[PDB]
C-alpha cells in the first residue's frame, strides 16, 4: 500500500503565506484531497481533486500536486486559520483511502491577553454534605500557556488540585478550571483560600474565604 | 440541508460490541458512498472502510477489517457501524462521512469526503455509571458571579442550560477536568448585572439524572 506523509507543525506570521506538504510515491498522479479539523469539531473539506475548492471556500486556500508531493498553500493566513490539516487520496492499488498524518498549523503574532481569574467557596449544601471543593476558572488569555498555584493562608496547597488544560473558546483565546477539594475542616481552619495564576510573567490572584 | 446526524455518547464494558448509526438527509442516499473514520483522543484520522448504500457491498482498512461490520437501511437512509470485542484502545471519536459517487465505475468517482457526521463518541470502560452532584456557587460582588458545580460524574458528556434555554448570553461553560476518581466535574457559571431567580438546568442522560438547582446569594 502507499503512505502519505505531512510535516507534523508549520508556522507563519500572520497575512504571510503557509505551504502544507502532502508527500507520497506518484501522488502527483492520484488526486489529493485536504481537511481542515479545529479541535472538537468535524473536518472540513477545503481542497479536493488537487485543486478545486467546494463552494464557500477562498481562493486564498489553493492546491498542486506533482510528482511526489501534494502541497496546500494558504495565503493572507488569518488567526482564524489554525487548525489541523490533512492531505488524503484514494489508492487504486490497495483500493484504500489513506490520509496523511496531519499538520498542526500555528499563527505566531496575535496579542498577549491576560487570564480573567474568578473563584467560588464551597456550598453550605456541600459542607452539610460533609463535603468541600473550591472553584478557579481561568479565561480569555491568549498565548495558551498558564500556571495556576493554590494559597492557603499564605502556603501552597498541592493535594486535592485538579486543573485542565489550556482549553480553546468561541473568542480564539483559551481558557482553563483548577479544581480545589479540601476536607470541611482545612476549609474552616484556614483564614482564607487564594488562586493565583501566572501568564507571561505576570501574575493574577483571587482570594477566598469562609 | 445535506447533513449527517449521528446518534449519541455511548459507554461500554471492554469485550462488549456497540451499533453506531449515521443518518443521511437532503440528497438522495444511493447516490454516495458512505466512508467511516476514526479518531482517538488526541489523534489523527483513520479511514476505517465504507459502503454502498445501494447494494451494501463493503470494504475495510486492513486495521479494522474483521472486528468492524457496516450495514445500512436505504428505507431510512441511515448507515449503521458494528464494532466487536472492544478494547480501551477503542475509545474515540467515530465519524461517518459521505464521498464517492455511484455507481462503480472502473476509476473511482472519488471527490474526497464532502459532508461529515458530527461524530460519536465511543468510551470503552469497566466503571459504572453515576450522577453528578449539583451544588450551587452563590455569587459575591457591576457584573456578578452566580455558577452551578456538577461534581463527581460518570460519564461524559452533561448537558447544562440556564433558566430552562432562557438566559443564554453570559454562560460560561467550561471544558470538564478528569479527576484522580475516575470522575469528571465542569462548572457552568453567569457573569450578570449586579442590581430575577437563576436556575440552572443540569442534566446527565447516561445515569437518567436531571437536577434542577436555584442559585440564590448568601
Known amino acids: 500500500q502507499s503512505v502519505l506523509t505531512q510535516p507534523p507543525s508549520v508556522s507563519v506570521a500572520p497575512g504571510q503565506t503557509a505551504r502544507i506538504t502532502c508527500g507520497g510515491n506518484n501522488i502527483g498522479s492520484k488526486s489529493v484531497h485536504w481537511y481542515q479539523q479545529k479541535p472538537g469539531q468535524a473536518p472540513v473539506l477545503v481542497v479536493y481533486?488537487?485543486?478545486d475548492r467546494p463552494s464557500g471556500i477562498p481562493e486564498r486556500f489553493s492546491g498542486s500536486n506533482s510528482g511526489n508531493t501534494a502541497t496546500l498553500t494558504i495565503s493572507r493566513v488569518e488567526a482564524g486559520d489554525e487548525a489541523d490539516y490533512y492531505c488524503q487520496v484514494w489508492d487504486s492499488s490497495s483500493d484504500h483511502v489513506v490520509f496523511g498524518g496531519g499538520t498542526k498549523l500555528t499563527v505566531l503574532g496575535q496579542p498577549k491577553a491576560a487570564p480573567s481569574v474568578t473563584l467560588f467557596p464551597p456550598s453550605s449544601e456541600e459542607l452539610q454534605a460533609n463535603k468541600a471543593t473550591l472553584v478557579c476558572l481561568i479565561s480569555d488569555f491568549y498565548p495558551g500557556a498558564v500556571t495556576v498555584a493554590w494559597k492557603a493562608d499564605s502556603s501552597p496547597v498541592k493535594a486535592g488540585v485538579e486543573t485542565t488544560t489550556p482549553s480553546k473558546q468561541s473568542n480564539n483565546k483559551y481558557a482553563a478550571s483548577s479544581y480545589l477539594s479540601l476536607t470541611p475542616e482545612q476549609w474552616k481552619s484556614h483564614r482564607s483560600y487564594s488562586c493565583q495564576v501566572t501568564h507571561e510573567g505576570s501574575t493574577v490572584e483571587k482570594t477566598v474565604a469562609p | 440541508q445535506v447533513q449527517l446526524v449521528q446518534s449519541g455518547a455511548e459507554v461500554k464494558k471492554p469485550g462488549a460490541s456497540v451499533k453506531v448509526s449515521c443518518k443521511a438527509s437532503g440528497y438522495t442516499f444511493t447516490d454516495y458512498y458512505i466512508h467511516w473514520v476514526r479518531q482517538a483522543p488526541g489523534q489523527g484520522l483513520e479511514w476505517m472502510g465504507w459502503?454502498?448504500?445501494?447494494?451494501?457491498?463493503?470494504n475495510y482498512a486492513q486495521k479494522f477489517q474483521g472486528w468492524v461490520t457496516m450495514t445500512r437501511d436505504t428505507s431510512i437512509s441511515t448507515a449503521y457501524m458494528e464494532l466487536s470485542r472492544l478494547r480501551s484502545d477503542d475509545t474515540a471519536v467515530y465519524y461517518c462521512?459521505?464521498?464517492?459517487?455511484?455507481?462503480?465505475?472502473?476509476?473511482?468517482?472519488?471527490?474526497?469526503?464532502?459532508?461529515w457526521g458530527q461524530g460519536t463518541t465511543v468510551t470503552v470502560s469497566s466503571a459504572s455509571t453515576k450522577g453528578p452532584s449539583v451544588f450551587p456557587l452563590a455569587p459575591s460582588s457591576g457584573t456578578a458571579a452566580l455558577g452551578c458545580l456538577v461534581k463527581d460524574y460518570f460519564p461524559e458528556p452533561v448537558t447544562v442550560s440556564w433558566n430552562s434555554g432562557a438566559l443564554t448570553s453570559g454562560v460560561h461553560t467550561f471544558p470538564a477536568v478528569l479527576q484522580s476518581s475516575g470522575l469528571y466535574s465542569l462548572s457552568s457559571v453567569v457573569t450578570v448585572p449586579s442590581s430575577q431567580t437563576y436556575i440552572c438546568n443540569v442534566n446527565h442522560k447516561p445515569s437518567n439524572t436531571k437536577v434542577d438547582k436555584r442559585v440564590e446569594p448568601k
Open positions: 481533486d488537487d485543486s
Open positions: 462521512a459521505r464521498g464517492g459517487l455511484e455507481p462503480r465505475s472502473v476509476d473511482y468517482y472519488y471527490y474526497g469526503m464532502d459532508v
Open positions: 459502503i454502498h448504500p445501494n447494494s451494501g457491498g463493503t
